[PDB]
Scaffold this active site. Sequence first.
Site, PDB file in Angstrom:
ATOM      1  N   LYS A 114       0.824  -1.213   0.000  1.00 30.97           N
ATOM      2  CA  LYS A 114       0.000   0.000   0.000  1.00 30.97           C
ATOM      3  C   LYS A 114       0.858   1.264   0.000  1.00 30.97           C
ATOM      4  CE  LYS A 114      -4.539   1.073   1.310  1.00 30.97           C
ATOM      5  NZ  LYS A 114      -5.780   0.289   1.058  1.00 30.97           N
ATOM      6  N   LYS A 191      -2.101 -16.008  -6.096  1.00 30.28           N
ATOM      7  CA  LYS A 191      -2.913 -16.856  -5.225  1.00 30.28           C
ATOM      8  C   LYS A 191      -4.387 -16.516  -5.348  1.00 30.28           C
ATOM      9  CE  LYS A 191      -3.141 -15.848  -0.618  1.00 30.28           C
ATOM     10  NZ  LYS A 191      -4.512 -15.200  -0.533  1.00 30.28           N
ATOM     11  N   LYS A 194      -9.390 -13.236  -1.825  1.00 30.33           N
ATOM     12  CA  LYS A 194     -10.604 -12.426  -1.821  1.00 30.33           C
ATOM     13  C   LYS A 194     -10.371 -11.002  -2.327  1.00 30.33           C
ATOM     14  CE  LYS A 194     -11.466 -14.875   2.565  1.00 30.33           C
ATOM     15  NZ  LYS A 194     -12.107 -14.858   3.945  1.00 30.33           N
TER      16      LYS A 194
HETATM   17  N1  LIG Z   1      -4.710 -18.927  -1.976  1.00 30.74           N
HETATM   18  C1  LIG Z   1      -4.395 -19.518  -0.827  1.00 30.74           C
HETATM   19  N2  LIG Z   1      -3.810 -20.738  -0.858  1.00 30.74           N
HETATM   20  C2  LIG Z   1      -3.495 -21.329   0.302  1.00 30.74           C
HETATM   21  N3  LIG Z   1      -3.672 -20.891   1.545  1.00 30.74           N
HETATM   22  C3  LIG Z   1      -4.254 -19.681   1.542  1.00 30.74           C
HETATM   23  C4  LIG Z   1      -4.635 -18.949   0.438  1.00 30.74           C
HETATM   24  N4  LIG Z   1      -5.202 -17.744   0.837  1.00 30.74           N
HETATM   25  C5  LIG Z   1      -5.155 -17.770   2.149  1.00 30.74           C
HETATM   26  N5  LIG Z   1      -4.587 -18.924   2.633  1.00 30.74           N
HETATM   27  C6  LIG Z   1      -4.371 -19.296   4.026  1.00 30.74           C
HETATM   28  O1  LIG Z   1      -5.569 -19.073   4.731  1.00 30.74           O
HETATM   29  C7  LIG Z   1      -5.275 -18.650   6.089  1.00 30.74           C
HETATM   30  C8  LIG Z   1      -5.994 -17.354   6.372  1.00 30.74           C
HETATM   31  O2  LIG Z   1      -5.930 -16.501   5.202  1.00 30.74           O
HETATM   32  P1  LIG Z   1      -6.807 -15.158   5.185  1.00 30.74           P
HETATM   33  O3  LIG Z   1      -7.839 -15.227   6.261  1.00 30.74           O
HETATM   34  O4  LIG Z   1      -5.898 -13.974   5.153  1.00 30.74           O
HETATM   35  O5  LIG Z   1      -7.538 -15.285   3.763  1.00 30.74           O
HETATM   36  P2  LIG Z   1      -7.263 -14.605   2.339  1.00 30.74           P
HETATM   37  O6  LIG Z   1      -7.761 -15.521   1.270  1.00 30.74           O
HETATM   38  O7  LIG Z   1      -5.850 -14.127   2.302  1.00 30.74           O
HETATM   39  O8  LIG Z   1      -8.234 -13.334   2.417  1.00 30.74           O
HETATM   40  P3  LIG Z   1      -7.951 -11.746   2.458  1.00 30.74           P
HETATM   41  O9  LIG Z   1      -7.694 -11.332   1.029  1.00 30.74           O
HETATM   42  O10 LIG Z   1      -9.196 -11.115   3.032  1.00 30.74           O
HETATM   43  O11 LIG Z   1      -6.743 -11.563   3.344  1.00 30.74           O
HETATM   44  C9  LIG Z   1      -3.743 -18.607   6.191  1.00 30.74           C
HETATM   45  O12 LIG Z   1      -3.232 -19.801   6.767  1.00 30.74           O
HETATM   46  C10 LIG Z   1      -3.311 -18.457   4.730  1.00 30.74           C
HETATM   47  O13 LIG Z   1      -2.011 -18.950   4.491  1.00 30.74           O
END
Ligand SMILES: Nc1ncnc2c1ncn2[C@@H]1O[C@H](COP(=O)(O)OP(=O)(O)OP(=O)(O)O)[C@@H](O)[C@H]1O
Lengths: 326, 326
Positions: A114, A191, A194
């Site tokens: 950011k 990856k 969201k």
């Molecule tokens: N694409 C992905 N592949 C594997 N593990 C993931 C992925 N995205 C998130 N994780 C795992 O999910 C857990 C929590 O991630 P988190 O709650 O930040 O979700 P996010 O998909 O990154 O959403 P945001 O974009 O809101 O941060 C962590 O252990 C992280 O490593």
Amino acid sequence: TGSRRIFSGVQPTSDSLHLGNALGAVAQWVGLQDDHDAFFCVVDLHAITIPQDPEALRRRTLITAAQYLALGIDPGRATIFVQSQVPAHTQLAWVLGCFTGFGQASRMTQFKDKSATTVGLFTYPVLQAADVLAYDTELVPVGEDQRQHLELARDVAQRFNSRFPGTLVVPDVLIPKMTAKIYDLQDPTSKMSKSAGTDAGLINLLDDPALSAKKIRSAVTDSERDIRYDPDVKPGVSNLLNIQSAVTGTDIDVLVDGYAGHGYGDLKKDTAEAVVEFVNPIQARVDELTADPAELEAVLAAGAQRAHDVASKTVQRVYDRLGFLL
Amino acid sequence: TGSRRIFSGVQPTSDSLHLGNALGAVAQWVGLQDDHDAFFCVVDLHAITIPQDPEALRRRTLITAAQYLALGIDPGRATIFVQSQVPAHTQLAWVLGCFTGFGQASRMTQFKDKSATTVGLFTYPVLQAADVLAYDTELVPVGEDQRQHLELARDVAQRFNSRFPGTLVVPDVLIPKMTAKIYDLQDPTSKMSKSAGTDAGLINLLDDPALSAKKIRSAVTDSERDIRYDPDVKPGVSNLLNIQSAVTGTDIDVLVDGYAGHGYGDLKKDTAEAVVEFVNPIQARVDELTADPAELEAVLAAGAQRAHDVASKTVQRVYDRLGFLL
Ligand SMILES: Nc1ncnc2c1ncn2[C@@H]1O[C@H](COP(=O)(O)OP(=O)(O)OP(=O)(O)O)[C@@H](O)[C@H]1O
Ligand SMILES: Nc1ncnc2c1ncn2[C@@H]1O[C@H](COP(=O)(O)OP(=O)(O)OP(=O)(O)O)[C@@H](O)[C@H]1O
Ligand SMILES: CNC1=NC(=O)[C@H]([C@H](C)c2c[nH]c3cccc(C)c23)O1
Ligand SMILES: CNC1=NC(=O)[C@H]([C@H](C)c2c[nH]c3cccc(C)c23)O1
Ligand SMILES: [Mg+2]
Ligand SMILES: [Mg+2]
């Protein structure tokens, strides 16, 4: 028992976990919970680093707990709880920030990403460190994207212990291999997150199964017309095999060999069809837990009391070491 | 009652308050405590933004509470408590940091002053805002050096209320006039602080009275040989009159008129002699409260329970507004 202590968390930032959350994190938790003392947290205090709708934040907090249970987390074996209900997290986070270099927190990727940053966007890795360290955590099962965060948690724990030996457990980071990254289907480089704008590359657990199957069937592969697992040269194709492997229990090699002579159309067929078979039992469990919330909020209530019993001891041990009057 | 709610705090960063703390803050508190609901806090969580010796931090926490009582704070009228014993402070601080601009916290003077900053040095103004806002505080009696901090507390309270109307009281900053700055005696330009290196310009409440009188008698005045109050042109001389006025109850004009024809030697004589008369009853009270700690720790224990009763309601009101599951 209380050994092989595990801690991990997911943010209630949306109405569904996606496949990355479920395969890259929550699937590991389910294997681990049998022989590890596990704490699984809905980290709502992290959610508000970004503005959140209050009715949604509450609803999504419960829905995230529910997806934990529908993915196999077992409230008889593990502890599920809501971060904000345990005051120790912010208490330890204040302390830990005093042992955290400003530059050390600046070099954190999302702050580089950011920098209209807030203090919360800047300090959330410190609160993440308190989340883990507050439970004498021996291992943290997370995906690959959380590694830099947890090296800060380990370093601050070591910096703290250098002044106060034996006070904080230094956690080992436990990261999976293949599933450690489920990639976006329209962009198999980055990856599945969201935050990629379009849900089009995003497989949500609780989405319409036919919609998710449609996204799978529409996935970006390559041109070789050879089904082989190589994440560099074959991004889309290795992701799909990774996905199909993870939701079925079949190794990737056994899959790739069964796909000799098959095309990419067959690959999407089976992966979609296995995902649909994966998510439908989840959605049925989630639907009941949303309609009948007694169970779910008893779990969270038992979890919060257990979390407070543990986390508050850590905080008083830290406070005593610092010299606070108790 | 519970009206005209007041909150203010001092850090247990040393073995003594100095005259600036006692005249620029704690003297106002004593006037206010009669008709205001007052919370006076030893802010130990702020102390550790800088490394602190644990046995000293605890001893100084109690000694700071004791100087509150010896300066006239009345545990029957007001509430004295230790910051770290009330978890709500860090809880609200996490929330408030999410409504606090990174740039808004960067432009804070002490962070400009250093930037080996830590996160705690960067975020402590946010924790200060939670200290005040957690008690539905209507007014904050502080010296002039705390004004920029409390405009951040007011702005964040207004930013929060814009999203959640009526949730947080916006405090009025209540700053004194003359005593609002007691200056160093060897450098009457800058404030008497625990950070100017030499204790030589520093009048500690609990120092040896003859030593403090020696520092006063050695104070830097000017050359006019006219006793008149003008803080710009007459830095040293106006400070001493300010000091003598504050510890005696006599206005500065009545003093300056009584000093017509007098020299600067007479000015230091009387100020030293009045300071000595001021600090000796304090040291006697402090000495008993250190030797007999039952009283003092009962006060802190009653204060912490009362603080928790108030501050935890604020935090749950904030949490409810944010949408956290309670
Ligand atoms: N694409 C992905 N592949 C594997 N593990 C993931 C992925 N995205 C998130 N994780 C795992 O999910 C857990 C929590 O991630 P988190 O709650 O930040 O979700 P996010 O998909 O990154 O959403 P945001 O974009 O809101 O941060 C962590 O252990 C992280 O490593
Ligand atoms: N020189 C001073 N004159 C008047 N008020 C002062 C002075 N120094 C501090 N204060 C007041 O004392 C209260 C607490 O100050 P604080 O605990 O930060 O002490 P300090 O003297 O600034 O020590 P430190 O250098 O450790 O910060 C505040 O209300 C502040 O305005
Ligand atoms: C914005 N806040 C945040 N973004 C992250 O990526 C982490 C993460 C959700 C997190 C917070 N606390 C945790 C404890 C254990 C394991 C993890 C993954 C976490 O926090
Ligand atoms: C380093 N921490 C810090 N340096 C300050 O100058 C403030 C101050 C001591 C402070 C912290 N909390 C408060 C609540 C009400 C009023 C005041 C003055 C404070 O905190
Ligand atoms: Mg994330
Ligand atoms: Mg100060």
